[PDB]
Amino acid sequence: ALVPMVIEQTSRGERSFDIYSRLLKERVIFLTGQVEDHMANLIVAQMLFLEAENPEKDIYLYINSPGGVITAGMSIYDTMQFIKPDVSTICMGQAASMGAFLLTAGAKGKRFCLPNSRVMIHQPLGGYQGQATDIEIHAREILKVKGRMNELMALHTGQSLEQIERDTERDRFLSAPEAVEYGLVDSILTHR
Amino acid sequence: ALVPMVIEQTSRGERSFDIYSRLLKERVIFLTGQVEDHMANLIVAQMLFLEAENPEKDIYLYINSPGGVITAGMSIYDTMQFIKPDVSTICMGQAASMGAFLLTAGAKGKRFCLPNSRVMIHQPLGGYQGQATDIEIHAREILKVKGRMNELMALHTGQSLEQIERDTERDRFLSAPEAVEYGLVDSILTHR
Amino acid sequence: ALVPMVIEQTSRGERSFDIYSRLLKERVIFLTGQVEDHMANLIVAQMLFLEAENPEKDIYLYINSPGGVITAGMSIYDTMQFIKPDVSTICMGQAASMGAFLLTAGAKGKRFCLPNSRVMIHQPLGGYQGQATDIEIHAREILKVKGRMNELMALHTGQSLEQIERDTERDRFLSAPEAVEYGLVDSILTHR
Amino acid sequence: ALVPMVIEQTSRGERSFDIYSRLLKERVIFLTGQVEDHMANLIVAQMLFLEAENPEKDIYLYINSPGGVITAGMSIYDTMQFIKPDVSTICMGQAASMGAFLLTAGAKGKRFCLPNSRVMIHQPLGGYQGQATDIEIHAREILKVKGRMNELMALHTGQSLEQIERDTERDRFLSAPEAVEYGLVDSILTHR
Amino acid sequence: ALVPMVIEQTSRGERSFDIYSRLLKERVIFLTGQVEDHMANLIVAQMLFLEAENPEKDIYLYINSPGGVITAGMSIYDTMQFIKPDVSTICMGQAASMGAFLLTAGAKGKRFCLPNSRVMIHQPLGGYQGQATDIEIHAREILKVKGRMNELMALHTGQSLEQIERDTERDRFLSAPEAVEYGLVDSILTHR
Amino acid sequence: ALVPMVIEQTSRGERSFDIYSRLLKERVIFLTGQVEDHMANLIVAQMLFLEAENPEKDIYLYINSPGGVITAGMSIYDTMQFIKPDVSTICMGQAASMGAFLLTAGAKGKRFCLPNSRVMIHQPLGGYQGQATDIEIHAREILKVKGRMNELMALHTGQSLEQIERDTERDRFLSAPEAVEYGLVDSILTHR
Amino acid sequence: ALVPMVIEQTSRGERSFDIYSRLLKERVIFLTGQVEDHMANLIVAQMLFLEAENPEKDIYLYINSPGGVITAGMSIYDTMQFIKPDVSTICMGQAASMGAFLLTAGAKGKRFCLPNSRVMIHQPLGGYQGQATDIEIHAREILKVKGRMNELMALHTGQSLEQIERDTERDRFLSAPEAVEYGLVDSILTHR
Amino acid sequence: ALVPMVIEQTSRGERSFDIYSRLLKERVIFLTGQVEDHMANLIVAQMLFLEAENPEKDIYLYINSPGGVITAGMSIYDTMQFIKPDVSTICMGQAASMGAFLLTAGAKGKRFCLPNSRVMIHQPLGGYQGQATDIEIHAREILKVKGRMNELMALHTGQSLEQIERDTERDRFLSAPEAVEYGLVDSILTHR
Amino acid sequence: ALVPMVIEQTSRGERSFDIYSRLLKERVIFLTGQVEDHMANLIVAQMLFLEAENPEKDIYLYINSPGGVITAGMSIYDTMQFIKPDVSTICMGQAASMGAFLLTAGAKGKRFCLPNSRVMIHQPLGGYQGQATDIEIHAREILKVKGRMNELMALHTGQSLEQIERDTERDRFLSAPEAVEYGLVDSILTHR
Amino acid sequence: ALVPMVIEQTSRGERSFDIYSRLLKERVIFLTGQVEDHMANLIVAQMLFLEAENPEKDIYLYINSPGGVITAGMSIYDTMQFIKPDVSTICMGQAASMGAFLLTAGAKGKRFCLPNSRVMIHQPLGGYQGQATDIEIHAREILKVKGRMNELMALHTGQSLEQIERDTERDRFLSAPEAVEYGLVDSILTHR
């Protein structure tokens, strides 16, 4: 019973559903832990599934994540922009590195975070071993990636590009009220 | 049978339910072991689930935990303070560190612990490796967290902030009667 | 087939039940292996369930275990004392250390053990590493626990406190007839 | 609950399927992780299954993978060309190495990638230990494969063979707009 | 969801089968990965099952494998020859070593491979440690096996025995068109 | 040459001694690295040897060390106090923990440190595992040692005892000028 | 001979020394590999030994090292400044990090490097684990060291302090001509 | 006897030196195995020692090595160019990578190799992990080194710079007669 | 005493040499173990040393070794062919692979083996991992070496090249008299 | 003092020799432990050394050995037969396997063993992994050795060849009196 069962009444009222499936039914998706490929593929499958179910309703994404692989994370980034319905992202716990990136990518006006949460941002990491010529190729690609993400942060936050450039040089930590002022989230949820 | 099944009768019931799901129906949630992200993620889902079923009834949270990750613990804390119904926390076994933190966060007047339990509190731990510049950044963040945790302790317990500041310098152990006197819990359950 | 199925009859049933669930239904709980947090947590859930189904009948606890974590063991102890129906404990195989402690915690007149069983008792173990200041703090806490466990032994067995302290300095082994004379159990079951 | 369940209505409505089975029903297949033999044996079974279900409709293949074993990739490669309905390949995240090989192999006019994706191509890798005579045999086989892979790239992309030969000498990275101009994909999906 | 489910309508309409069972029903068996005892044992059970289901219809065996244990593989070989209906083998990906051996053992006129596949053949491997007397016994046995394997290759392929012996001295790789000319397969499948 | 040889002339001039023996001859002892039993024993043998050669002349002890095991360190301390000639201690690099303790134990008026050195002091560390009874014994002994070390610090430095106790609760770092003002050393050497 | 012996004539001519001792005799000291405590201690012993032999003659220090422990490096630095004769440093191979620091510490007008050498400089690294209180203490100390390290660079190179701070934020590599222009060395040696 | 002793007569005849010292006396230095810091440091000492002994006589350097660290190899190179007597290099066994570089650095007209030797040349290897900004710094530095090594090859061999760049793209193996035509060596030694 | 000392008299009788040096003095060199770089390097030094001592006298090389790395072995081979005095090679125990190669390279008429010895010959081994292009480069170099080694076997033994080529396809073992007939050695030593 | 020094008087009397060198002087050689190549090589060097010293006097070889590699051991065997003076072998402790082989190889009439020593003999051990073709080559190679070892045993002991072959199929143990009767040794030593 790592994951409990719940029961809901309908017509027949017989069906029971793993608590996470019960939430998927209500259009709630959770993103937790490291961002990698298998995890991300599952999240994308859930979004495509909900898009098909009802193209006219919002999807709520709950984020609590330390970061992860950029390539994997970008498949979520693009799915969210490609599917028709809005995705509203809510930050709880933490949204760091790639987690923060996806958090700001939610529908404008619908980006919210709980009051004791933390958001942290920073330039991408990477590395390589090989011949001097291969090193050059791989170095150029990571720099292009850094530049591209810098452009997307400016687009979603409203900050100038140069300001974004300075702010990601070293780990930058933001409290929930700062994330609001900075422009990463629109508001802080407080009480029901 | 790591987890046994139980049987209940209702309308046409029948229906068997893993003993932990049987208790979820009674609005009982257990929090045990280390506080981490996957566990915490699941508890939050359970609280949202109960909040939706009946916004007007109390949720009982059983705590028996040695401590854990602060970020994960804060996710739980913020949900408890958001959802409409009261959460009544009961400490059994131990509530140490972050576990103690969540124990006192329950609804006022409803924080209760069993007579042979133990509660322990202490300032947060952490660390880092890197360039002197990055060490500075990370040191500032841990100090801010320490400060925030102390304010929340003072708020929930009624102690002055300085008293909280002195008492968490080193591990402080409290017996159940001491937790009551100090202000971490309101009362001790004895016999039905 | 690690755990076999059994079939029972009722009205319409039939009904197949993991052999351990079949016994939970008869108000029988088994406690085996090391006492720890996850397992203890489950024992507690089972006792609360049975208490609700029929507050007027006894619960039988079968004990066969080498010992374990005191904190986890205390949660079981407090629940046994809190709930309304008597809990009758039966020792088979062995009841050592924390296992022996819980054995004597059963309802008076209802503590029974099988004739070739063994009971062993001893003062608690522990340890620590750190600054001399931290060592003192932790040393005091273990001594407080030792004192508390002795009080409870004296209370439940009828021995004076001084006698309990002398007898637990080093491991002490008792045969079933010795446990009866000493006061840990009330009687020995032989043949039906 | 690693994979959530979804419920759909039909006549009776008794349909409960893991989200991936639910999407197979809509003719969507995902390819993620390394390309190997057990995985690229399940994809083949799924494509054959869909071909029979309806020989006149498109199959959608989502590709997000770093590369893999050429043999495994080739059984997929040949099945896609053999079966009657078009396979439309969509690149998300990354399509590197053998992953890119399969991406370009989809139906003409239907090869598309999301805007922040990456495609990377390069000559095949391998190795051997043994007698000089065996080394020669194995060296020849890998060179034949390199030659064959280059012909297939030229066929599908429209580049001359010599241009393909010059571009795969070292890891070549292409951004989504570059893949379009180069000829690996036909277009970029933007919004539904 | 490692293996997806598929639904099939009949009379009443309730059929849910793992995709691999769905294909067994169509008389398709898949042989992949290393050939060993447990897997070989399952392939034989499936063939006997189909033989009984309908003695007058062909069985299709899909082969994609690097090789394996001769002893285990020979139990598949003998079953294929014993049973009544023809077994048609199709090579995809690769058929190396023992894989190639089983490939050519299918019904004459029905051995077919896909165009980008590879087939590789070689003399058997083995080894031993022990006293000089034991080494001799084990050396003789492996040589008898080499002899028997060559006779069967010559029988099924039409090559003279001497030609088979020369060609298996060292790893020999054959492309799909060569396998056809050599006589390992009868033809190459192209498009539906 | 992990350690080089040097040549000096006396009478006949045939003197080639390892560089460390050459300096022992000038009544110079180097103490570096962790202070543990085998190494400390050698430091003591060297001091006894020098005392015998000339009871009226000073011995120079160079200190550069991160810490030690205390017991070993005390045998060095007591020897320095017991032998007749003054031991003048010089701190280069660092003198932490036990190293700092021995540094201040040098003859009054002769404690000196180089200008870019660091001195750090703190209360002793330790630990134990066992029965609650043994834990008590070991905890008492470490506290007695802490007390004794503080008395010796106050004696040698001129600080009040109360001040020493407060200052060793947490690691305290002192720059060379701070060591002078505090009273750990008498002066800073500058240039010959 | 891991290290060869050489023969030199004097008076009787019976002189056979380890080539490194032969060079110590010419007032040549080599500093190579990581800078740590045991090796640094030896370098200091050699300099004291040479200072005693002839206070009026220059000592030559050859440097080829990647870096090391700051504390160990400082004991070398202070001895060089303390002893009377000029120490002339020569860089061959590389002088990185702490090695670069010691290189510039040589007598003004006598710092020289070979033409294909490399010099690299950066801010110091460090780290720590523990209670938030201890983290603060250790973070403060590393920052103080960083500050001290910048003052000495500016002192020896003639650069302004602000310029030094900017230039050590991230590793900066200098070719031999750059080291001269920047002021780390006075000149480049070419041919005897 | 890892290394044997040999006897030679001068005056008194009492000379028994390790065979390698015996050859150092004849101005012969051997460079074997990987080039690294400690070994390179020793070669430099031998070369300086021989220059002093007799500035007018050639030094013979035997090379047999697979390659090594560029920095260490460069300190050898600079010494060869700095010291006054010519250094004649002779290659036996192999001179690969950095080993080949040093081979060509010998005095013009005196570079010679044995007839069955092999010489191999290639571009520098390296790598790095860290932030995109740090990658940018290190990648640039390895490219600067590559450029410098190519200039030195062209200078010593007489090849144009463009020709050197093309030839070091991938491992290039040369036989002794090829090394002569290319210009890495002046001639092949045959028989005494 | 892994290696014993022996005493011999010349003039004053003061000669005590390691038994291996005692035999080096008689112009005897032993070759045992694998032929690698460091060991081969020592043999070359010994042969150069003996050549200088007396250019007109034979050098005896005892061979007992299982194999080697070829490159190191070729430096031994070239030295034997360069130095003026004949080298007489004697095989005892075994001369396999590279050992056999060096055995046959000795002076004609002076190659001899003991009667119970074994000689074994085979084509060279090697391997490589990497891009298909690099595999091709490395795969060519190993074949050039195979070619050259066969050319030298034929030259020294008198066998035709075609015959050598056939005989080294697989391990070929020869007894002492067979080696004589084949032409690897000139004769068998029997008794003094 | 792993090995002690001993003093002897000769002429002047300045003689101090390791105890093993002292015994070599008396023509005593010890063979102990496993037989391998580095060890065997030393024994041969010692025997060649003694043969030269005095061709007319016996050499004593003490054997105490569990066995070892035949190839290495045969180099001792052949040297013993080649050199002019008789070699007398004495067995103490044990002479097993190859150790027994060498024991009987001593001069006829001079093979002696101590009364509680034990001797054990058995056919050769070995093994191989590879292609069936290589297995055959290596298997024949070990059988030839078995045959040759059998001939030599019969030659030295006087047993017929058929008897030797029957006796070595399984480990055969002989007490000292049986070794004498069998013919492995000539007699048993008793007391001086």
- Would you list the DSSP string of chain J? --S-EEEE-SSS--EEEEHHHHHHTTTEEEEEEEE-HHHHHHHHHHHHHHHHH-TTS-EEEEEEEEEE-HHHHHHHHHHHHHSSS-EEEEEEEEEETHHHHHHTTS-TT--EE-TT-EEEE---EEEEEEEHHHHHHHHHHHHHHHHHHHHHHHHHH---HHHHHHHTSS-EEEEHHHHHHHTS-SEE----
- b or e along A114-131 (b: 16 or more beta carbons within 10 Å of the residue's beta carbon)? bebbbbbbbbbbbebeeb
Distances (CA, A) of J108 to H45, J99, J182: 59, 17, 14
- b or e along D130-150 (b: 16 or more beta carbons within 10 Å of the residue's beta carbon)? ebbbbbbbbbebbbebbeebb
DSSP C9: -
List the single residue in C with minimal CA-CA distance to B94.
Answer: C71
Given an 8 Å threshold on Cβ–Cβ distance, is G92 in contact with H81? Answer: no
Backbone angles phi, psi at A9, to 5 degrees: -85, 145
Given an 8 Å threshold on Cβ–Cβ distance, is A135 in contact with H145? Answer: no
Q: Which two tokens stand for residue C45?
A: 């859930």
Q: Cα–Cα distance between D28 and D20 in angstroms, integer?
A: 9
From the list A1, A2, A192, the residue facing B82 with the nearest CB is: A192
Q: Which two tokens stand for residue C103?
A: 């054995």
Report how far apart the first and last C-alpha atoms of chain I are (Å, whole number): 30
CA trace torsion I31, I32, I36, I40 (10° rounding)? -20
Q: Is D118 part of the contact surface with chain A (CB cutoff 8 Å)?
A: yes
How was this structure determined? It was done by cryo-EM
Q: Is A162 part of the contact surface with chain H (CB cutoff 8 Å)?
A: no
> Going by beta carbons, is chain H in contact with chain I, meaning 3 or more pairs sit under 8 Å apart?
yes
Contacts of H148 in chain A (CB under 8 A): none
Q: Is I84 part of the contact surface with chain H (CB cutoff 8 Å)?
A: yes
Contacts 24+ apart (CB under 8 A), D147-152: D148/E116, D149/D70, D149/D101, D149/D123, D149/D124, D152/D101, D152/D105
CA trace torsion D105, D107, D113, D119 (10° rounding)? 10
Q: What is the CA radius of gyration of chain H?
A: 19
List the single residue in J with minimal CA-CA distance to E171.
Answer: J131
Q: Cα–Cα distance between F18 and G45 in angstroms, integer?
A: 11
Q: What is the CA radius of gyration of chain J?
A: 19
Q: Cα–Cα distance between G3 and G23 in angstroms, integer?
A: 13
Q: Give the length of chain C.
A: 192
Q: Is J137 part of the contact surface with chain I (CB cutoff 8 Å)?
A: yes
Q: Which of J122, J138, J175, J186 is catalytic?
A: J122
Class of domain A1-192: alpha beta
Q: Is B137 part of the contact surface with chain A (CB cutoff 8 Å)?
A: yes
Q: Which two tokens stand for residue B11?
A: 């309308």
> Going by beta carbons, is chain A in contact with chain I, meaning 3 or more pairs sit under 8 Å apart?
no
From the list C123, C130, C131, the residue facing F131 with the nearest CB is: C123
Could you tell me the resolution of this structure in angstroms?
3.1
Q: Which two tokens stand for residue G55?
A: 């206070």
Q: Is A122 a catalytic residue?
A: yes
Distances (CA, A) of G48 to A12, E78, F26, G76, G87: 95, 87, 11, 11, 12
- The neighbours of chain J, by the rule of 3 or more Cβ pairs under 8 Å, are E, I
List the single residue in A with minimal CA-CA distance to D114.
Answer: A78
- b or e along D158-169 (b: 16 or more beta carbons within 10 Å of the residue's beta carbon)? ebeeeebbebbe
From the list C123, C130, C135, the residue facing F132 with the nearest CB is: C123
SS3 category, E179: helix
D32 CA to chain I: closest CA distance, Å?
24
The helix (H) or strand (E) run that includes residue A160 is none
**Which parts of chain B are beta strand (E)?**
5-7, 16-18, 28-32, 59-65, 87-96, 112-113, 118-121, 125-131, 172-175, 187-188
Q: Which two tokens stand for residue B100?
A: 């103690």
Q: Give the length of chain I.
A: 192
**Which parts of chain H are beta strand (E)?**
5-7, 16-18, 28-32, 59-65, 87-96, 112-113, 118-121, 125-131, 172-175, 187-188
Q: Cα–Cα distance between G41 and G21 in angstroms, integer?
A: 17
C-beta neighbour count of E167 within 10 angstroms: 17
Given an 8 Å threshold on Cβ–Cβ distance, is E171 in contact with D42? Answer: no
Q: Are E116 and E94 in contact (CB under 8 A)?
A: no
> Going by beta carbons, is chain H in contact with chain A, meaning 3 or more pairs sit under 8 Å apart?
yes
Q: Is A86 a catalytic residue?
A: no
The amino acid sitting at I40 is A
**Per-domain boundaries in chain G:** 1-192
Q: Is G94 part of the contact surface with chain F (CB cutoff 8 Å)?
A: no
Given an 8 Å threshold on Cβ–Cβ distance, is F143 in contact with C136? Answer: yes
D33 CA to chain I: closest CA distance, Å?
22
Q: Is E132 part of the contact surface with chain D (CB cutoff 8 Å)?
A: no
Q: Are G95 and G103 in contact (CB under 8 A)?
A: yes
Q: Is I86 a catalytic residue?
A: no
H106 CA to chain G: closest CA distance, Å?
15
Contacts of I77 in chain H (CB under 8 A): 116
Given an 8 Å threshold on Cβ–Cβ distance, is D192 in contact with A84? Answer: yes
Contacts of G4 in chain H (CB under 8 A): 18, 20-21, 24, 46
Q: Is H64 part of the contact surface with chain I (CB cutoff 8 Å)?
A: yes
Report how far apart the first and last C-alpha atoms of chain G are (Å, whole number): 29
A180 CA to chain B: closest CA distance, Å?
17
Q: Which two tokens stand for residue F59?
A: 């011995």
What string of H, E and C letters represents the secondary structure of I16-81? EEEHHHHHHCCCEEEEEEEECHHHHHHHHHHHHHHHHHCCCCCEEEEEEEEEECCHHHHHHHHHHH
Q: Are I77 and I71 in contact (CB under 8 A)?
A: no
E92 CA to chain D: closest CA distance, Å?
5
From the list G33, G173, G189, the residue facing H37 with the nearest CB is: G33
Listed in sequence order, the residues at least 6 apart from I180 whose beta carbon sits closer than 8 Å to its beta carbon are I113, I186, I187, I188
Q: Is I4 part of the contact surface with chain J (CB cutoff 8 Å)?
A: yes
Q: Is the peptide bond before C14 cis (omega within 30 degrees of 0)?
A: yes
- The neighbours of chain B, by the rule of 3 or more Cβ pairs under 8 Å, are A, C, G
Q: Give the length of chain A.
A: 192
I79 CA to chain H: closest CA distance, Å?
9
I177 CA to chain H: closest CA distance, Å?
30
Q: Cα–Cα distance between B7 and B20 in angstroms, integer?
A: 12
